[PDB]
Design a protein around this nucleic acid. Structure first.
Lengths: 193, 115, 116, 147, 144, 46, 46
RNA sequence: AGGGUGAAAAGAACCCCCAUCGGGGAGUGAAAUAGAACAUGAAACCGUAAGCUCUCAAGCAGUGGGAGGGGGACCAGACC
RNA sequence: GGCCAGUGAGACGAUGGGGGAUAAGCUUCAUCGUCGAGAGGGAAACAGCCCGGAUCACCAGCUAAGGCCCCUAAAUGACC
RNA sequence: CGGUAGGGGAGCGUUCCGUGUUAGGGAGAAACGCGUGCGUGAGCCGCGUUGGACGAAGCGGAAGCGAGAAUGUCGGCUUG
RNA sequence: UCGGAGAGAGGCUCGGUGAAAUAGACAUGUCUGUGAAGAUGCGGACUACCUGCACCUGGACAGAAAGACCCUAUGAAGCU
């Protein structure tokens, strides 16, 4: 009897439509529908987002061009959007952030003597495996690990910064393969780059 | 004059009933039921004082992220510059609540802070 | 490692294994159909094919090697009077390894040997 | 003792779908209160207040039950189109409210213990709170600041 | 109670361990009497045979106490519990003595016929509840 | 060698945050002009 | 060699249910042998 | 070291499984979930069923906030 | 004064010294601060360092020490 | 109105006794389990398709009177 | 040196029977730092899907067993 699972499933979806209510977005929105003032007191408590507030479909998309941009301040201004601290919906327990795309990772500027003296060393578990590895060696070898190492220490390294680590999309080429949500260029507030 | 009793089992059964959903021998085993009652109550203390502190922090960063959407360099400190110079006594960071429940009304707040 | 050691040794030491081979192929030639374990079944299969084809050419030397291998006296002389009349033209493959239920007490994989 | 049986009254199922589809959905309209909104200052802390809401607050110094009480300490009274940004109080303001029966809230078990220095204190606290229902907001028609 | 559907058969504290009786009793859960009849004929366990004796004396029970068939009859729960454990003070070297417990089981197997109505269509009728008690005896997803 | 390492509570008198800028010690809190007193919190209406 | 502490209900129900699931795997084999033992020409089980 | 089925053994006639032990009907009893391991039966311990949930995860296992989901509901905003 | 206890192993930090090697989180003293018996905040963590003295509640505000790129609250603030 | 060693004041609970052959109780006492209740808390009160005969409160008294520790101890049952 | 092969009893798998020392609960990583001065438990970083089986024993200051060595007791005892 396939009609048991199918037809009772569509009856459960039908009463999901009849009992439950949708969650309206926060755009040109007033305080309450007249149904909402009869419901819970969501005013005097702190606003906490529901599942229809942090959908990854309608998140923002940002594209920087990392040509002649210095690394760490770009990493901080990518971090401040990768968290969601430019949105008034910022709750630090959910994923309110925005996807970012960093093209031209091969041409990221640094200041001083970072290129020959800053080491991206790593180590496995056994002794004597500490890998000597400098900035020009990655930028010659795999450049898109540079920025990916800069912003990974900018995000809260628990279960939630690991989830918004995948929002970072760094590509070394001049062109990114994304045409997802027509990615608008990233707004900067940094006068010294 | 023997004095066998039952009061340790009501004394102990109340603490047993409070220690529900403690994941294992913290929810079944008496000699840990006691210290999970104890540590649960002091957890309630420090997380209550720091829920006052923590929601203060949350409204500070929420209205900071609301004001910084103008683009021109208007920080959260300047919103309090011209929030106490223009005499608005103590909106108590509940403008961080109507900053998302009523974003046009907080645009009226800030656009009357400018003038 | 056991690369290419094609002797099939049982859970018994060497001389006891030889006595198990000789006694169990002796009573296999006595009754025909027999209940063994499967390791004992294949271990009977090689040696009893050697004893059917040993007295296939009924000379004195084959009869004396064959009497030397088998325990009982009156079963070797009932063998070469029976195997050319029955197992001529068969040209190998004198048995059958019909398996059965495992044994109560060990879960031993238990087999059953024919003469066909 | 058997499987019971099929029962035979020979029934006919009414598939008219003008009675069950009347019975199962419900028509309940929310009451239109009005297009108004204020933020009152009670004790120290401020409350988002809309006309008709069972708020909880602090006052048990003295307030009789079912009393009609004006909360005139209003800032940021707001309609659907315009809000009134309160230089501290909007003048001549009146949030009409109904101070209802007084309550004690949930138990807050204040149990303190330090460490092996053997000290532990179970005390409790029932905060003397008061539930207030809101009637309507008036006296707010000065200096509009619509955008 | 399911309105007179199941047949509950208990068991003595038989002289074997509970855990092996619980792997052989967790095998035969949910399967009808024919499949357990052929599997417990051939399961290579010593805990198999009193379980097969209690299944056989449980469905013969279900055919003589009730009047059912041994083909439309599935095993419902088949719970095995602990029993009494004897204590055997067995001596061991350097002057020591170890308690060797002789464990016993406590088998309770419940059987389940399908005594169904098999109604024609699904469509709900919110009328005559004193017939709705009898028309619905064993279903799923009970709303209100 | 003969240079003693600074252990605990000598580490705390050395490596504690000290604001050794003579400007930032002079700072008092900001002063806004005084306001008239706010009205009554509520009023009996009969 | 001597165990430092004891295991939970957690890890024990995991290991015992791996043991009894290891008992589950050796009866669909017995269902296949009991099904092939039925009516059919099979050159086994005299 | 090991006490207490009932008020009265009224201690289960007879049928089935079956070598027993035991179990299910039936019968006695107010009670058979009072069945001879027999009176109330708690915790540790072992289980089975139902609701939600865990397989990129670092944690004295809580607590504050609470996404999503489930249950009855009547002060339907509440409770678990 | 009456009745009636504990305590009499202290620790570090500043100053004044002796023992040492003006070595020790060393040892012994004299005045003081903290811990002991003190929670909270700053000190990454961290008894004795700075602010500070916890009756309790609030999804209140202003501050001390200390901070205002991100992790983590507040200035990628201004001028030398 | 922080608090260790410690000192003082005020209370809850338990079993028995006076009132007491108390009120109440096979129309369900004690027990055991339950709470959207009340207390500063020890605890009280209320509800139970479990159980089956005792026993409150108030005003008082007396203790083999309150458990998480003693490589305690006696039974039961785990881990490996 | 410089190991190598082979035969048994174990070890590995299956079926039966079935312990023990130990054990606060364990959701039981590495480096580095801090801390009663040798941390899975605190801090920062890095690394790790869950869970078995077979071996090895570096750590859990692993198990034993109120350190035989050292000192204290206005202890005990033998001997001179």
């Amino acid at each position: 009897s396939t009609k048991c699972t199918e037809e009772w499933r569509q009856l459960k979806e039908a009463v999901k439509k009849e009992f439950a209510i949708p969650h309206v977005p926060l755009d040109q929105r007033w305080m309450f529908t007249l149904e909402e003032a009869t419901g819970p007191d969501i005013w005097n408590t702190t606003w906490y987002p529901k599942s229809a507030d942090h959908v990854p479909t309608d998140k923002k998309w940002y594209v920087v061009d990392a040509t002649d941009l210095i690394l760490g301040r770009m990493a901080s201004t990518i971090a401040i959007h990768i968290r969601g601290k430019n949105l008034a919906s910022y709750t630090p327990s959910v994923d309110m952030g925005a996807f970012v795309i960093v093209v031209n990772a091969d041409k990221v500027a640094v200041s001083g003597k970072k290129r020959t003296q800053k080491l991206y060393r790593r180590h496995s578990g056994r002794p004597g495996g500490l890998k000597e590895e400098t900035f020009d060696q990655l930028q010659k070898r795999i450049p898109e690990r540079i920025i990916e190492h800069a912003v990974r220490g900018m995000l809260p390294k628990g279960r939630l910064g690991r989830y918004l680590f995948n929002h970072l999309k760094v590509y070394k080429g001049a062109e990114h393969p994304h045409q997802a949500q027509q990615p608008i260029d990233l707004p900067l507030r940094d006068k010294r780059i | 004059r023997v004095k066998r009793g039952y009061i340790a089992r009501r004394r102990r059964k109340k603490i047993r009933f409070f220690a529900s959903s403690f994941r294992g021998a913290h929810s079944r085993l008496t000699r840990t039921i006691a210290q999970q009652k104890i540590r649960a109550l002091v957890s309630a203390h420090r997380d209550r004082d720091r829920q006052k502190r923590d929601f203060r922090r949350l409204w500070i960063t929420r209205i900071n992220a609301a004001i910084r959407e103008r683009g021109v360099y208007y920080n959260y400190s300047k919103f309090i510059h011209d929030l106490y110079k223009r005499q608005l006594l103590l909106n108590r960071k509940i403008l961080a609540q109507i900053a998302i429940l009523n974003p046009n009304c907080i645009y009226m707040i800030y656009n009357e802070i400018i003038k | 490692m056991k690369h290419g050691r094609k002797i099939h040794r049982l859970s018994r030491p060497a001389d006891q294994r030889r006595a198990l081979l000789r006694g169990l192929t002796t009573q296999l030639l006595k009754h025909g159909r027999i209940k063994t374990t499967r390791a004992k079944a294949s271990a009977m299969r090689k040696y009893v094919d050697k004893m059917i084809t040993l007295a296939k050419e009924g000379s004195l030397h084959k009869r004396r090697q064959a009497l030397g291998f088998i325990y009982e006296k009156q079963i070797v002389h009932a063998l070469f009077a029976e195997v050319p009349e029955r197992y001529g033209d068969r040209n190998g493959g004198y048995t059958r390894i019909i398996r059965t239920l495992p044994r109560r007490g060990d879960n031993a994989p238990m087999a059953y040997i024919e003469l066909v | 003792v058997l499987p019971d049986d099929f029962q035979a009254p020979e029934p006919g199922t009414p598939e008219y779908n003008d009675i069950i589809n009347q019975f199962l959905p419900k028509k309940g309209p929310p009451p239109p209160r009005e297009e108004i909104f204020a933020v009152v200052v009670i004790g120290s802390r401020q409350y988002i207040v809309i006309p008709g809401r069972w708020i909880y607050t602090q006052r048990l110094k003295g307030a009789t039950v079912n009393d009609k009480i004006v909360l005139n300490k209003v800032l940021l009274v707001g309609t659907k189109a315009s809000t009134y940004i309160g230089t501290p109080i909007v003048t001549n303001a009146a949030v009409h409210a109904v101070v209802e029966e007084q309550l004690l809230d949930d138990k807050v078990i204040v149990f303190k213990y330090k460490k092996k220095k053997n000290y532990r204190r179970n005390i409790g606290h029932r905060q003397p709170i008061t539930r207030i229902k809101i009637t309507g907001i008036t006296g707010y028609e000065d200096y509009p600041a619509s955008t | 109670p399911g309105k007179c559907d199941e047949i509950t058969t208990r068991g003595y504290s038989i002289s074997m361990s509970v855990d092996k009786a619980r792997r052989v009793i967790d095998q035969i859960r949910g399967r009808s009497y024919a499949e357990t009849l052929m599997i417990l004929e051939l399961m290579p366990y010593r805990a198999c045979y009193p379980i097969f004796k209690l299944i056989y004396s449980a469905a013969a029970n279900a055919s003589h106490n009730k009047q059912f068939n041994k083909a439309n009859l599935i095993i419902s729960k088949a719970e095995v519990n602990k029993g009494i454990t004897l204590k055997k003070v067995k001596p061991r070297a350097r002057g020591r003595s170890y308690m060797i417990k002789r464990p016993t089981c406590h088998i309770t197997i419940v059987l389940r016929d399908i005594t169904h109505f098999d109604s024609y269509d699904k469509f709900l009728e919110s009328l005559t509840p004193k017939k709705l008690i009898a028309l619905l005896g064993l279903m799923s997803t009970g709303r209100r | 060698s003969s240079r003693p390492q600074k252990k605990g509570t000598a580490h705390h008198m050395k490596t504690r945050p000290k604001k050794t800028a003579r400007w930032d010690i002079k700072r008092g809190p900001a002063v806004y002009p005084p306001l008239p007193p706010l009205p009554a919190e509520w009023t009996i209406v009969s | 060699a001597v165990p430092k502490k004891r295991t939970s209900i957690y890890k024990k129900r995991i290991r015992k249910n791996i043991w009894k699931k290891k008992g589950y795997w050796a009866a669909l084999k017995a269902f296949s042998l009991a099904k092939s033992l039925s009516t059919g020409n099979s050159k086994s089980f005299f």
